[PDB]
RNA sequence: AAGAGUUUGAUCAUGGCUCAGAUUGAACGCUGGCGGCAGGCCUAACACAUGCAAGUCGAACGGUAACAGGAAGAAGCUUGCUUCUUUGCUGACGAGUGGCGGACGGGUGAGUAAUGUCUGGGAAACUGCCUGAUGGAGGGGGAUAACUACUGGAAACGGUAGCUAAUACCGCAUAACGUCGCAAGACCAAAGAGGGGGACCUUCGGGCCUCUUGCCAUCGGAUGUGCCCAGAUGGGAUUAGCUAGUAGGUGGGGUAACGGCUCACCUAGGCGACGAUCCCUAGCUGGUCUGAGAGGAUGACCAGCCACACUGGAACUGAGACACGGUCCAGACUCCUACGGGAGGCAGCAGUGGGGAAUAUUGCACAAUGGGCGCAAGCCUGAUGCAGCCAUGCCGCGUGUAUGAAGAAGGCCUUCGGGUUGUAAAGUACUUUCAGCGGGGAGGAAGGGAGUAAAGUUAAUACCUUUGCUCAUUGACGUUACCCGCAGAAGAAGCACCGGCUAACUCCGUGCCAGCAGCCGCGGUAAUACGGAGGGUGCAAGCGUUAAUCGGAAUUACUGGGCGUAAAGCGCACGCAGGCGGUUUGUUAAGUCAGAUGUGAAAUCCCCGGGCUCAACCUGGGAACUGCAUCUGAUACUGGCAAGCUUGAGUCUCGUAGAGGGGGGUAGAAUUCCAGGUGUAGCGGUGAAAUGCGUAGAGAUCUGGAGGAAUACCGGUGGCGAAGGCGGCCCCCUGGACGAAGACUGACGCUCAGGUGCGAAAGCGUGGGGAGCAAACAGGAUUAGAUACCCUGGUAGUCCACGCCGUAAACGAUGUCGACUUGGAGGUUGUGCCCUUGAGGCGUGGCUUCCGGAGCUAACGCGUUAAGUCGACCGCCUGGGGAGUACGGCCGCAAGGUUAAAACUCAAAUGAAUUGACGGGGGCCUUGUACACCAAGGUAACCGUAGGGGAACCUGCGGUUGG
């Protein structure tokens, strides 16, 4: 949308469901992803592969936004919190 | 001996946010350490630290 | 009135009196101002049958005080036994 | 009477008006029977949480003696003043004069 | 709370010497003047409890005292009770 | 337990409770046997046990253990009981005087044979 | 009340011999002994505290032919009286004129002795006393009445009756039949194995 | 101590003498000292000493035969709550006249056997063993 | 002379009359404490001499009225 | 109901009887005394005194009343008469 | 002088229960010989047939119905034998009058909670008979019952008319030593009868003499009664106010007497938390039982006092009564009736019905001892003495003794030999208590009667009194005790028990039945436990069972108890009365102590004797009655009073810390919505979905608003507060705490029922407030069904102002205050000394944490912050359940709270710890409730409060370790 490879991953880490937005440095949305309801509901949820593949979805939400460099702003703890780290950053993006 | 005012021997006694370090790693008498306290949270009142 | 009279104690077909300074209307062997001797009728020739202490009798009989027959008469064998 | 340490943070926004509320203030508490002991200012220093939307604040904290009374006034005044957003006074309970 | 000063002055009027603020009727004095700067700032609070507690010791501390005066010499404790007013 | 709580209100004699109640201080007392009727014992026993059901002269109506290896009782018949618990259901704190009123001694019986009201045989 | 039954098993269970079948058979051969007198008397005898005070005082009060009511009489009197309530009790228990009357000799047994005290063959002090526990004092002349002087069995009942040594503290004579009781008995001329603190403890709770 | 400064002074003997403490202290009133004669003279304790004139205090000093206290049990019986009052012919004889029992009779303090011969009772102050 | 009881004084409301308090200190019949045990007495004087507090001496006499019957003898401290 | 006893009850109708006579007639007596003091007029109740005088102290004599009762009228009698002087 | 059993796998506890002991006014079962001595309706103070329980006196009186004598008469005519009449002429006496007695003695225990009793005092009194003293005792009258004549009424009971006596009554005289009165004065009484008789008189009756006895007055005595006071003598506070002749006064009156006793007036007291008043129970005491004792329980018999006499009133008469066998009236009963009207009261003795588990003769005698009357003789006496009935108790005695075996028959057990019953029997010789029969035979009987001298006295003799001696005589019991004789062992033994406690055991029978049982428990093929047998044990004219009291039980703990976990410390404070009080002097003498004196009835009990054949029993003398009172003395102690002292407590000064409390606004963390964009497929969740959101722009982003919950970190084994409890910062107000010392007061303290105040959270009520909650409530699915669990919303409430609640696992499950007592470590704060560095080193304070010694403890544990050692005061507890419930009171807006039973019901409940079994919290070692012999487990244990709900369950806000 703005093609200025910057701004913040607000990883909204609730414990059953993260929805992170990838918001610039004005404060503007860029896209947003999930991982419940995007490919897999249940109680079952809340594991460190939940937060991974949620982090994948919204990397690549945003990967044909021209950014890579995505700082993290979490909001609350979530389960996989360094998993859904990892696979954020391993898409190419920078803290 | 230690009052508010003094900001440079504050920040070895606080964090970047300003949350207050536990006198079991530093040692400051018990006594010292209510008045470091009250000047920390003066000083945050006072807006020099969050 | 006061009487010496006997009040009759022991046990049955055994009796044995107390000679009893009292006034008249009681009970004869009820209340009693005071007891000047005994008398055992039925006594063993040893035994002291009488005894009568008669000083207090006399002392009585002075302040107007009648005495039954009986001990009238015993007063008079203890006299005579001297 | 008795010492106390009036600190108060002037902003850059509210600096145009730095010597004429001190100064006043000074004079309404000399005419309140007190007596200034010490005097002196810190520059407009910055706040680490920008509170009430601003960076920079000229603090000057001038610490007068004063009795039970003479103080309601002054507070009462700072907060109906938008020259200090907060203003802080402080007990001695010693004999504290020069200023650091 | 009473001030020093206040303290010095009820010893010296209400005091048969200097420094005998342990005579009785000093004692009775000077609590009793600390009972009625409660009672003046009684009205403004009401809603406080725990510095009632300290009142009433007062108050019957005050009492005690006057109490031994009344034991101990009669004339101290009728001349004092109107000099200082109490026992109303 | 202080003395001069103890001088305030003294210490207090406990009644003696309730034992045999229905009697008031009688050996015996005369019943009229309302019904017959026949128990059965607490758990570690058995063998249903002979009891009858009486109304004594002083209002009281009582549950009493007629007792020995035989019994003639009827539905009105008069009859003593003395005091002398059954370990048995609850309740049965009397027994009946074994031939004395309208109850006869036990038949056959040679000993302890006054405790049951049936004379010497003559022999 | 007499107990009036077997003289012999009475005495073979308090297991030594009581002088209650006297004269000469000498018992043991007069009747079994040794050995208790039922069809269970061979069990072993192994009798608790309880039993032994028992014994011992039932052996006193068969020895001179005494019920409970009078030995607990005797008892409450030693227990009153001054001294060990032990020795004051066996002294009342010989100081009893059927007792004393067969310890003279004349009366063979305490029962021959009891059967003359009653049947109004003994003078106590020149006059006559049947009651078989006229406690006799001492100085007191024991006589037999002279209407039953001639009796076989008083002649007979004092032959046998030096082979029983003596009593010291009594002076019989035996031509004219009559003696002296001189002096209450001591402990030691009671010549018996009693046991008596066994009884003074049976009565003492 | 505070209402009752006799069983004060008991108290602080057999406390001092469990403890084997050589010598107990408290302030003196003549009453203690007369106790402490009493104890000292028929040899309970060895010897006492008062010092001082505003505030005079009881330097007694314990007595243990081995290593034992001499007093077995020391006992308070008339305290303010049963003054007790024994009249001669009643005086109590202490573990068969082995302990003293000592008694304030109108002739001063004093001890059993001293009250039974001079023959007049009064107060129990205290049984010794 | 007689016995003269000595008592207080604890109201003189009556014509001529007194109620007088006499304390006595009697042991506990079981207990063996002693307990103040009081006894409140009507008195006479025709005088009215007497006031709340005083200590008097009283002696029996024959019944002056109902619940009457002990007079006063001194006042032995006229209480203030 | 015995002998005696009736005789008792028909002697004691006659004695009380015969009481009540001299106890009314000595009544008027005291009565005239006390009436005549209230009047006021003291030479009429010192002759009444006079009149009732041996009245009442015959009838104590005789046992109907007690010595002490006639004493009593007597003291009281005199007593209101010297007031009244 | 302080048993046994009885809660466990086992134990140490706490703690109740059950039996062991003694006892009884006992009862009941079986059994039963004699005697002695006692006791004998404890229930219906229920109703009472019948007899008896109070009379006496002729020496007070008129009499004279009776009986008996006379004296006659008249007769019959026996020589006057006996028949009528007459005569109170005499003994005597029925009814009557009169006196005394009937107020005692006898019963009962309803009422009475204190003026009743007991202890000790008092003053204002009277007291028949008895007694001492002094005096008197004159002279009259009128009645009246009886009786006589009538005459009602069924009867009870009367009425009229006449008649009459007295020691009946009534004047009159007399009249102090009496009463009234200051005194002067006034006033006030009485009765004769009997015996004898000289002289004398005699109206022949008597007078007269003398003795006896009575009468009257007064004053004493003695006795008895009345009255007063103090203390002591049940329970209930689910009785706290009660009192108006009530409290006092002054005066009348009244009483034998003081007094409100009463009245008029006056005054306004009086009583009460030291328990008034009210309700319940109750006769009290000596004493009795029990107990080591304290104490408890009692109050039958005996004795003292009280009260009562069908119920409720009233008095009369009398010395005395408000009268058990008197009166009246009012009841309710029963009886009698002529239906008009009458009668009666067994809590006398006996007896009846009744009731009851249960308690006796419708006896004999006044012989004795008392009592009444009488001069006496005597009479009366259901008092009393006795007898009867009843093992009801206590005591004593008997039912034989010695011998003997073939150790019999026979019974039972037999391992088949025998054993055992068992010297037991029989047979032998002997005894003959008591029972039976016959003969004798005390003592309880002293007296009274008749006769016999003193000049007793005096008409000397008489009469009477007294001693004088002689004679005759009196016993209900009673054919007494006791002794003598006679037969003949002759007439005389039972009941419980036998597994352990607990002395004593085998066989059959039965078969968890029948049954037993104080406890343990026994019985389903033996079962020494149940029934029978044999054998034994125990006690024995009894033996068992029941009931009740006390002890055991120190299990109401004054002696002599507990409250951390067994029941039990108030939720916390302040504090009234109360309880208690540092030290030195003076004084008092209250308590205390000592001495003296008085008293504490007797009996009982205890000691030492004596009498009963003995014993019981009876008895003498002592001791004891531990008490109460008074007086004299001491002064140590406590108390009072007086004076002090500074250590207790406090005041001041100076500092120290702290979420101590109240005020106000105070900024942000986070909070949701809105304000918009940024964004389009998701937001959403559980056992699983789902319900719900959104694509109409959701989630998140920054931008700004809100409002409120909490001020994260600090933070703590920290701190503070009396407890609940207290956490931003600033300031104001304020409390408390401590350190330093000083100055001063000068015991001014501690603890406190009742009381007052504060008091989690819930709640409630009053209005706001609501960003989220979150009971209730509403969507989905549950699960064996779901109103499980659960996810979605969601009110009240949560928040604020005010008020009411008054509660909690309000917990250290440890009341307050003071004092003393080995340690160690830690933290918390002051502050002194000396390093004058800032700490430093050495202290010294307070606070607090963890060990740990002694000490304590059931053990765990506590252990100088006690759960040790003590003191003071308070609160509290007494097996479990019922039940912190009912009822009552009180409180609250109600909700409810607070105080707090009882019936009924069990034989246990309970605490600590231990062995190890599940040990799904670890590396041979770790563990738990419960458990055994299921604290990691479809979702802690609770307490408070509020909801939903048939409910116990769940769920909210708060809190606990009893995990």
């Given at each position: 949308r703005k093609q200025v490879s910057d701004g913040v991953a607000?990883?909204?880490?609730?414990?059953?469901?993260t929805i992170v937005t990838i918001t610039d440095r004005q404060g503007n949305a860029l896209g947003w992803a999930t991982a419940g309801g995007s490919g897999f509901r249940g109680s079952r949820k809340s594991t460190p592969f939940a937060a991974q593949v949620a982090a994948e979805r919204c990397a690549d939400a945003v990967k044909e936004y021209g950014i890579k460099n995505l700082e993290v702003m979490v909001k609350g703890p979530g389960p996989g919190r360094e998993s859904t780290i990892r696979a954020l950053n391993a898409a190419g993006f920078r803290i | 001996e230690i009052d508010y005012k003094d900001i440079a021997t504050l920040k070895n006694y606080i964090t970047e946010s300003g949350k207050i370090v536990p006198?079991?790693?530093?040692?400051?008498?018990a006594k010292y350490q209510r008045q470091l306290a009250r000047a920390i949270k003066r000083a945050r009142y006072l807006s020099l630290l969050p | 009135m006061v009487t010496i009279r006997l009040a009759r104690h022991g046990a049955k077909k055994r009796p044995f009196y107390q000679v009893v300074v009292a006034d008249?209307?009681?009970?004869?062997?009820?209340?009693?101002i005071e007891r000047v001797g005994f008398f055992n009728p039925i006594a063993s020739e040893k035994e002291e049958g009488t005894r009568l202490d008669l000083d207090r009798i006399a002392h009585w009989v002075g302040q107007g005080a009648t005495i039954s027959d009986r001990v009238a008469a015993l007063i008079k064998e203890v006299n005579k036994a001297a | 009477m008795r010492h106390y340490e009036i600190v108060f943070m002037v902003h850059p926004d509210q600096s145009e008006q730095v010597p004429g509320m001190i100064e006043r203030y000074t004079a309404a508490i000399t005419g309140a029977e007190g007596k200034i002991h010490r005097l002196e200012d810190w520059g407009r220093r910055q706040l680490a949480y920008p509170i009430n939307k601003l960076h920079k604040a000229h603090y000057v904290l001038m610490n007068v003696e004063a009795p039970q009374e003479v103080i309601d006034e002054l507070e009462t005044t700072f907060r109906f003043n938008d020259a200090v957003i907060r203003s802080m006074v402080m007990r001695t309970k010693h004999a504290v004069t020069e200023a650091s | 709370s009473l001030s020093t000063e206040a303290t010095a002055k009820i010893v010296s009027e209400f005091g048969r010497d200097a420094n005998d603020t342990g005579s009785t009727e000093v004692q009775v004095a000077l609590l009793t003047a600390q009972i009625n700067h409660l009672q003046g700032h009684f009205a403004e609070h009401k809603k406080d409890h725990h510095s009632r507690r300290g009142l009433l010791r007062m108050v019957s501390q005050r009492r005690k005292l006057l109490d031994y005066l009344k034991r101990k010499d009669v004339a101290r404790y009728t001349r004092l009770i109107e000099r200082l007013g109490l026992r109303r | 337990a202080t003395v001069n709580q103890l001088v305030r209100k003294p210490r207090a004699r406990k009644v003696a409770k309730?034992?045999?109640?229905?009697?008031?201080?009688?050996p015996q007392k005369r019943g009229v046997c309302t019904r017959v009727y026949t128990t059965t014992p607490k758990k570690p026993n058995s063998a249903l046990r002979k009891v009858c059901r009486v109304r004594l002269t002083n209002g009281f109506e009582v549950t009493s253990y007629i007792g020995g290896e035989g019994h003639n009782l009827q539905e009105h018949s008069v009859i003593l009981i003395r005091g002398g618990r059954v370990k048995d259901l609850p309740g049965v704190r009397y027994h009946t005087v074994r031939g004395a009123l309208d109850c006869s001694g036990v038949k056959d019986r040679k000993q302890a044979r006054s405790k049951y009201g049936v004379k010497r045989p003559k022999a | 009340a007499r107990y009036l039954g077997p003289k012999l098993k009475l005495s073979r269970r308090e297991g030594t011999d009581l002088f209650?079948?006297?004269?000469?058979?000498a018992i043991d051969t007069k009747c079994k002994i040794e050995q208790a007198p039922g069809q269970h008397g061979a069990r072993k005898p192994r009798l608790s505290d309880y039993g032994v005070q028992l014994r011992e005082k039932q052996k006193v009060r068969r020895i001179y032919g005494v019920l409970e009511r009078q030995f607990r009489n005797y008892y409450k009197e030693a227990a009153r009286l001054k001294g060990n309530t032990g020795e004051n009790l066996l002294a009342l228990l010989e100081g009893r004129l059927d007792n004393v009357v067969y310890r003279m000799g004349f009366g063979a047994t305490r029962a021959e002795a009891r059967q003359l005290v009653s049947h109004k063959a003994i003078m106590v002090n020149g006059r006559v006393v049947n009651i078989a526990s006229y406690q006799v004092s001492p100085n007191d002349v024991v006589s037999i009445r002279e209407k039953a002087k001639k009796q076989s069995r008083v002649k007979a009942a004092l032959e046998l009756a030096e082979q029983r040594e003596k009593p010291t503290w009594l002076e019989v004579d035996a031509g004219k039949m009559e003696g002296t009781f001189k002096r209450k008995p001591e402990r030691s001329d009671?010549?018996?194995?009693?046991?008596e603190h066994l009884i003074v403890e049976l009565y003492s709770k | 101590s505070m209402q009752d400064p006799i069983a004060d002074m008991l108290t602080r003997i057999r406390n001092g003498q469990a403890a084997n403490k050589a010598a107990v202290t408290m302030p003196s009133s003549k009453l203690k000292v007369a106790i402490a004669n009493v104890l000292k003279e028929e040899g309970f304790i060895e010897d006492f000493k008062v010092e001082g004139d505003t505030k005079p205090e009881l330097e007694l000093t314990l007595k243990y035969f081995q290593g034992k206290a001499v007093v077995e049990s020391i006992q308070r019986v008339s305290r303010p709550g049963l003054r007790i009052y024994k009249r001669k012919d009643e005086l109590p004889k202490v573990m068969a006249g082995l302990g003293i029992a000592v008694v304030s009779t109108s002739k001063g303090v004093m001890t059993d056997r001293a009250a039974r011969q001079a023959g007049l009772g009064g107060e129990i102050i205290c049984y010794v063993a | 002379k007689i016995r003269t009881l000595q008592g207080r004084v604890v109201s003189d409301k009556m014509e001529k009359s007194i109620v007088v308090a006499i304390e006595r200190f009697v042991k506990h019949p079981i207990y063996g404490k002693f307990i103040k045990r009081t006894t409140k007495l009507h008195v006479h004087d025709e005088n009215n001499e007497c006031g709340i507090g005083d200590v008097v001496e009283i002696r029996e006499c024959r019944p002056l009225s109902k619940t009457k019957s002990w007079t006063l003898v001194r006042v032995v401290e006229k209480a203030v | 109901n015995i002998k005696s006893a009736k005789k008792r009850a028909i002697q004691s109708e006659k004695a009380r009887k015969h009481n009540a006579s001299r106890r009314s007639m000595m009544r008027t007596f005291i009565k005239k005394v006390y009436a005549a003091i209230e009047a006021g007029d003291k030479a009429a109740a010192q002759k009444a005194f006079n009149e009732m005088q041996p009245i009442v102290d015959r009838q104590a004599a005789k046992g109907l009343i007690h010595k002490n009762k006639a004493a009593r009228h007597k003291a009281n009698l005199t007593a209101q008469i010297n007031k009244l002087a």
């Open positions: 607000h990883i909204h880490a609730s414990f059953n469901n | 006198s079991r790693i530093t040692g400051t008498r | 008249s209307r009681n009970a004869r062997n009820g209340r009693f | - | - | 309730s034992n045999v109640p229905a009697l008031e201080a009688c | 209650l079948k006297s004269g000469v058979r009671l010549s018996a194995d009693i046991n | - | - | -």
